[PDB]
């Protein structure tokens, strides 16, 4: 149907506005501590703690697949990827810190993508 095609469309653009919501809150990771997902060799017991791990690449591979809907389910993985740092490591470390300037900084770039979003529609 032509109405198929026009959401698709719409999630396409969606997916091309969160495309540049995620390399601007990804370079507010200058450091790369959340580029990746924490490595299950390295932190064996990783998932004891996080249930839902996210990290940078995983959310590039959903975007990718245009497996975004909406804002929130975009705003929902880079809040976990927040999330999960702050509750696994202490407050004193460089990981913990580099979270709350990644939350802090990216509260300003998601702020107008939001009003984006409603904007077009």
Known sequence: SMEQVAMELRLTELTRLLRSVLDQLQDKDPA?????????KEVPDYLDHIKHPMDFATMRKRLEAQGYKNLHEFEEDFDLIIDNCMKYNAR????????V????????????????????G
């Open 92 to 99: 004193d470390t460089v990981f913990y810190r580099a979270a």
């Open 32 to 40: 790369r501590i959340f580029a990746q997902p924490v490595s299950l």
């Open 101 to 120: 300037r990644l939350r802090d900084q990216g509260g300003v770039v998601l702020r107008q993508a939001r009003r984006e979003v409603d904007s077009i």
